[PDB]
Design a protein around this ligand. Structure first.
Ligand SMILES: *[C@@H]1O[C@H](CO)[C@@H](O[C@@H]2O[C@H](CO)[C@@H](O[C@@H]3O[C@H](CO)[C@@H](O)[C@H](O)[C@H]3NC(C)=O)[C@H](O)[C@H]2NC(C)=O)[C@H](O)[C@H]1NC(C)=O
Ligand SMILES: *[C@@H]1O[C@H](CO)[C@@H](O[C@@H]2O[C@H](CO)[C@@H](O)[C@H](O)[C@H]2NC(C)=O)[C@H](O)[C@H]1NC(C)=O
Ligand SMILES: *[C@@H]1O[C@H](CO)[C@@H](O[C@@H]2O[C@H](CO)[C@@H](O)[C@H](O)[C@H]2NC(C)=O)[C@H](O)[C@H]1NC(C)=O
Ligand SMILES: *[C@@H]1O[C@H](CO)[C@@H](O)[C@H](O)[C@H]1NC(C)=O
Ligand SMILES: *[C@@H]1O[C@H](CO)[C@@H](O)[C@H](O)[C@H]1NC(C)=O
Ligand SMILES: *[C@@H]1O[C@H](CO)[C@@H](O)[C@H](O)[C@H]1NC(C)=O
Ligand SMILES: *[C@@H]1O[C@H](CO)[C@@H](O)[C@H](O)[C@H]1NC(C)=O
Ligand SMILES: OC[C@H]1O[C@@H](O)[C@@H](O)[C@@H](O)[C@@H]1O
Lengths: 203, 203, 52, 150, 150, 150, 150, 150, 150, 150, 150, 150
């Protein structure tokens, strides 16, 4: 596969460059030019906040779409010889959208606390704004990734259940147990994203 | 072109520059001929101690009175890295019982190296040595500034930790954003390219 | 003499990034295109598949 | 106070906000078109009905435009970094959500188009699932709007 | 006070609008062409009745060229970086939207040109499907015109 | 005073702690569900039993919580770099341990569902193997605690 | 005044201006000529009438050559950022345009020559598709003549 | 005066001692599980004798846990960075050695468990290969302890 | 005054100009040789007619040598950035154009070699294609010489 | 002016001295057992005789242990750049030599056990082959001593 | 007085030149020998007439040895960085030239040693092809001496 | 004065010199062992003759063994950048030349052993080819030696 080879080439070149650069700089006693403080103090907190805000909805929507297609294709295909399964097996799609609903609510909640400031140097901004930006970025990232993996698992099991239900009517009502257990990880992601940013007082 | 050395029973403060010129009411005038070879320059106000330095150049009667440019430099022990850095903390001008502060910002190098910065004028194509508005007088063009303070050994002038820029303050933010967009565009391209079709046709 | 600095000039920290990214992009483009033009399907028609 | 680097982020947000949605809608229309080509030969009578998935994909395009002009109606030379990154976040959100919705619409449209050819009753069900796919775009738009005021 | 490098970004817009644009007009104008060969052998009568996708691909190429020529005509050497950002953003938006439109028109044409030969009715459907892809291209233009004026 | 970037490391650790645990739990749950669904056709009476794997995967998710909460409660504005490093280490350890344990439970359950479908005496044996996978996850938890409350 | 390294771009845009375009032209031949051979065992009469794709690949190559010379003859020891950066833009534009046009020309030539070996009636329509590709070359030239020139 | 950031490296060492090794042991059970899926369906009586690879994986996990606990316990505030690098090296050493041992144990157990279905005497060969396959982790543990205690 | 590593690019000019030309010629000869070996065994009469795809391919190497001797012998000790960048552009130009030309000769040589085994009348037309397949290189050489004239 | 904190590289040497070499032993086992059980389907009487391929694999592991200890025995606070670099060299040499030996012995044993399954007369001669693979490992150790001793 | 690169580049050129020559000659001779060994199965009686390609591959490695010794001899500690860059360039040039030529010789020799078993008339033609590969070798020398003198 | 980090390059040179020889001798034995195992099943008489390749790869091992010792024989603390560079060049050259020679030895040995399996007297010609491969590595051993004396 050409695309995989391209990705591997880029990745290997990147890491080889990193390793060689690091070793020569460390041997060259030039550790005073590696001042990570400047790297993580020049960056504005609002960049971290807004990246978190974008991801907190983007990744959730990606997971919702993944699960939507993965279950819908099988639901539509398997009902040709059994139209009875069209309406019985709509729970999976409902959960695949509930993921995005949680994502939107979290985006609204974190979107608050965006009062600007006037400081332009690290000594004037202070610790509080740095904490705010980092915490908001972390909350956005964790909620997005949690809901992404949640939606993927939900979609896969929804496809399995929908496909198996066409054989015997008395299957789905008990196979939906894994379907319901899918959403708990997304709920946990939302809870942690809530808790991480419960003490931000940006402004 | 020899530099200027402050001899407190040893080489203690050394200064060099390829240009150093001054303007009062926007009339630029030459001062390198009045330094770097003139041994009678007013160094009475100069002071030295480990972890402190003042270099005061009081140039001779020009435009009605002697004019004093005073560079105030300090150094302190940084806890986390366990090293000794310095920075020219301040700059003052004394003509007639008047004070100002052309505050210095972009200067810091360890006690292992000297400094260098081309075309550090102060005004438009420089962007620093700020006067905090109320712009009254005394523009001053420095080009190829160089300094060593708080410990010297002999007349030797060591290699310099030039602040020409590791990468930059801003392109780090720009590159982070653009790479983040690039990953998503590659997500799009992988699926836009690897779409598939059907062969022949149903009767 | 006094061991002066090399005269590393300002604005260099931007030109480095600019030239680096342009070079990387152009190199990647030529690599991909030549790579695709190598693994090429001639068709395997009656000229090729046929032998003996 | 604010450097000249500021409007960079807002302008790129404005561009991406629509670019990603356009790509998603294009893929959806492509997949639905090949699905229609497959479906047509046996059951012509459903053709004017099977346009329903295609127009649905087209919706995504319009949604992108609802933001793609809006951010462009607020940009100015004297803008701080804060508003610029707000615009960037709105643009990324709407663009990626449009991409995901386009993928989903294309896939389910192809599946339903193939399905109806052999079972007309499937038609109803197809549209139902497609509703969810449209909602994927809608949410992605909404947040962007409330990121243009605050 | 303006930085010297500023004009660079706008210049890249002068490239980018065209750069991806032609690429879209190389995705379709070729692929649909193969389609019109595949059944010139059997039903040559419909050779000119399904060449529409290629003309549309040319139209997206024109959509790119218009923004490119305006971009070049609005050039200067002391451009403030904000106008430079705007110009590059317009170029990127038009280019990538054009690439996507070219893709969609190409694949849909390569499918429909084959579909038409099994039954005539499908022709009507395709006159809609193709045009939907074209809508995307037009949309790109509009946003560029807001980025070159506001 | 302390540096202004101390909390960043703890923030990233708290994020990763749940991200990796969620990915592992999702994989394990998906594979167990697929196995149950595949098996359900032939042996409808074993459906309850084959749920034992999936719930096992769920427990790993809980482990993630027990870390990510604990960091978020102990984080404040001006912590020292030492505590931030400690929390980052604990978070990454538990996250990746949970991920590996999730993969193990997924594979073992996918095989064991089949083994019990075709052979009753298999079942209890595979139960033992599943416990072993869980053991790895728990070990991660231990390390994080010694690296968190210290 | 003018930086001395500024000449770099002034030449680099020239190099790319020949390379990318020319490289696409190679692709073109490698789908046209080969195809003719496959169709030249049974209809040896249609040898000379299948050279048109080759001459159009030649056309797309000469486009890149003429632009490269036009942006390379303006160089001297004191190039200013303005001119050099314009040449970079023009070279990138025309190079990628020629690349896309050559790719499309290659696919068109392959399919068309394959389709003309069984029914001559295709031939005229084949040429039509081909011209829709050749003009794309011209499109690149246009931008290059309004960036490098001014 | 030793700096404060030096402690960071030491913490990361502990992480390796519970991350990398753990992943190895994951394989050390997981592959073996699917091996059982082929063994007991015809030869179930040997299931109780087929747990040995799983116990070896547990032993690898035990080695990882003991070294990780030892590294974490010794950590303090006033560390010379040399100590931190020594701890990092020991942790990486044991982690990668345990990874190798787990991989070899998993593959060998899979091969032997599938092979015993047609050789009743494969038990001794499996054991005698497994001792060698597991000694690697013991050597890595020995050197990890000798480094850490020093 | 001038940079110390300014001559690097001057040497790299000749280096690339020789190496990529040699690579292209070698690949062309290799693939043409595979073609002659595949084809001529059935028909010995053409053992002296499929020699053109090799000897005409070898002209690439002589072109590269013509450039390389001049570039190597046009390097002085007092080279500034301007001259070095001119040399670099010339060398990269000839190298990449020669690569593309070599590729085209290789593929068209394979096609003509395997096509001439059927009927002698494919001797003429294919060689005509070959002419253009070599001009893809010739053009490039010309511009590079201009980049060494200044 | 002692060297700053070079001791880092010193420890890293020890790591390599078994991180690769020990890994090589693992690979060997993964092949040799993969041979033996296959060969056991046929001759169950030669299981004991077929373990000699395994034995030498273990021996190479011991090399990667012993040299490693001889590094960690010299560690102190005041290691200079000299000694630390010598440690790096020794560790890298022995580790990578052991890895190569492991690959060789693994492939040889895998092919050879299956080969000898049919004809015993190979076996005795094959022992000589295996010995030379082991000898490669020996040579590695020697170099990693001589450099480390100076 | 001189930089630290006064001798890094000479050694790098020598090393890389000899390494690339070795890789190229090894691949060429190995491919030719595999061709000979496979050919010998049906017509073993032609081994002693087909040793030519192996020597034609090795001669270029002799030339690489010549250039490696030459770049070695001109290296001292008071040489300006100009000659350092020049010798590195010459070494890399000859190395890659040898690599390409050796690979071409290998491919042609293997395919042709397989081919010649069925037709004696092939014998002459291949020899001519081989000399063409040898031409590339001498071209390397035409530059290898030049950079030594200027 | 001499920078203290000078010994690094000589150290890594010696390490790489031996390591690449190890890799080559591993590859050679790896291929030739499979060859002799395949051959020995049906004709055991030739086994005495077919032990040659691994015995020969041992010499490729010795090539690097001696050079590493000679390199390390002249290392101390007061090494200037010069002699360190020379040692590095010698080491890398010998290592990778031995690697390439061993690669060729392995491929040709396996193929020739398989060929001699039926008709033994190919050992007359096969062996000659083998010698050339070794001799390639000898070109390295001279050059490196020279760079160790100057
Ligand atoms: C050189 O130093 C400063 C930058 O390096 C410039 O600004 C000074 O910084 C102060 C804090 O660092 C400003 O804040 C003021 O602090 C004083 C003293 O605590 C308070 O009374 C003020 O409320 C507070 N804020 C404001 C808005 O005034 C100072 O204003 C300012 N110092 C001054 C004006 O003396 C200085 O401008 C520059 N030095 C001079 C003399 O201009
Ligand atoms: C610094 O070198 C420059 C030339 O590179 C000299 O240029 C003069 O600069 C002053 C103001 O600083 C102007 O008023 C003069 O007109 C310039 N003279 C010219 C261009 O002939 C400058 O003299 C040097 N040093 C000083 C201290 O000014
Ligand atoms: C302090 O000194 C300056 C000179 O550096 C004084 O300049 C006056 O300028 C006029 C110009 O015509 C001269 O004739 C006078 O002799 C100068 N003195 C006075 C008292 O005017 C300037 O006035 C003083 N600056 C202050 C107080 O800011
Ligand atoms: C300082 O001492 C140096 C070194 O001896 C001497 O050359 C120089 O003239 C002295 N400078 C002053 C200002 O006394
Ligand atoms: C130097 O300047 C000071 C400033 O207070 C003055 O008192 C002193 O007399 C001056 N010295 C000379 C030598 O002019
Ligand atoms: C020493 O430095 C201190 C700190 O600023 C200062 O107060 C003192 O005057 C300096 N000089 C001495 C002690 O001679
Ligand atoms: C200046 O350098 C000397 C010599 O290395 C060093 O001992 C001293 O600490 C340095 N000065 C300061 C203030 O740290
Ligand atoms: O600025 C220094 C002041 O002190 C006194 C004289 O030196 C004058 O030049 C001025 O009034």
């Amino acid at each position: 596969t050409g695309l995989e080879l391209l990705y591997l080439g880029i990745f290997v070149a990147f890491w080889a460059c990193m390793v060689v650069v690091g070793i020569c700089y460390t041997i060259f006693d030039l550790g005073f030019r590696f001042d990570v403080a400047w790297f993580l103090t020049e960056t504005s907190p609002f960049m971290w906040s807004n990246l978190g805000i974008g991801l907190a909805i983007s990744l959730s929507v990606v997971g919702a779409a993944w699960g939507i297609y993965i279950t819908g294709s099988s639901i539509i295909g398997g009902g040709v010889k059994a139209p009875r399964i069209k309406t019985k097996n709509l729970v999976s799609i409902i959960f695949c959208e509930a993921v995005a609903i949680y994502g939107i609510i979290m985006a609204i909640v974190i979107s608050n606390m965006a009062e600007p400031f006037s400081a332009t140097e690290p000594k004037a901004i202070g610790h509080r704004n740095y904490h705010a930006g980092y915490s908001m970025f972390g909350a956005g990232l964790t909620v997005g990734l949690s809901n992404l993996f949640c939606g993927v698992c939900v979609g896969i099991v929804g496809s399995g259940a929908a496909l198996a239900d066409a054989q015997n009517p008395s299957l789905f009502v008990k196979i939906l147990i894994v379907e319901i257990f899918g959403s708990a990880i997304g709920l946990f992601g939302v809870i942690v994203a809530i808790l991480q940013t419960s003490r931000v007082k940006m402004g | 072109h020899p530099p200027v050395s402050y001899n407190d029973t040893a080489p203690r403060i050394l200064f060099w520059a390829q240009n150093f010129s001054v303007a009062y009411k926007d009339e630029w005038k030459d001062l390198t001929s009045l330094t770097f070879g003139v041994e009678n320059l007013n160094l009475t106000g100069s002071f030295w101690n480990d972890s402190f330095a003042m270099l005061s150049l009081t140039y001779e009667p020009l435009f009605g009175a002697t004019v004093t440019f005073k560079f105030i430099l300090a150094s302190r022990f940084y806890p986390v890295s366990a090293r000794y850095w310095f920075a020219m903390e301040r700059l003052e001008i004394h003509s007639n019982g008047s004070v100002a502060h052309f505050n210095v910002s972009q200067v810091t190098g360890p006690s292992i190296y000297s400094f260098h910065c081309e075309y550090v004028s102060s005004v438009s194509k420089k962007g620093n040595l700020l006067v905090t508005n109320v712009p009254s007088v005394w523009q001053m063009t420095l080009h190829n500034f160089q300094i060593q303070a708080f410990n010297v050994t002999g007349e030797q002038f060591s290699y310099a930790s030039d602040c020409a820029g590791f990468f930059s303050p801003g392109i780090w933010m720009g590159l982070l954003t653009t790479l983040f967009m690039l990953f998503i565009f590659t997500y799009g391209l992988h699926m836009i390219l690897s779409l598939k079709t059907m062969d022949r046709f149903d009767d | 003499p006094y061991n002066l600095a090399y005269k590393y000039n300002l604005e260099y920290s931007v030109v480095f990034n600019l030239v680096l990214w342009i070079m990387i992009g152009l190199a990647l483009a030529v690599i991909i295109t030549s790579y695709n033009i190598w693994n090429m399907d001639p068709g395997y028609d009656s000229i090729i598949y046929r032998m003996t | 106070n604010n450097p000249e680097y500021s409007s960079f982020f807002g302008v790129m947000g404005a561009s991406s906000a629509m670019v990603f949605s356009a790509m998603g809608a294009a893929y959806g229309t492509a997949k639905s078109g090949t699905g229609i080509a497959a479906m047509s030969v046996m059951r012509p009578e459903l053709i004017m009905k099977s346009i329903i998935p295609v127009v649905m994909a087209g919706i995504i395009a319009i949604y992108g435009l609802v933001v793609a002009v809006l951010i462009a109606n607020s940009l100015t030379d004297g803008i701080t970094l804060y508003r610029s990154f707000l615009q960037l976040g709105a643009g990324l959100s709407v663009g990626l959500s449009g991409l995901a919705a386009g993928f989903a619409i294309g896939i389910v449209g192809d599946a339903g188009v193939r399905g109806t050819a052999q079972q007309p009753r499937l038609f109803v069900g197809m549209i139902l699932i497609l509703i969810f796919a449209e909602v994927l775009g809608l949410y992605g738009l909404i947040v962007a709007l409330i990121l243009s005021t605050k």
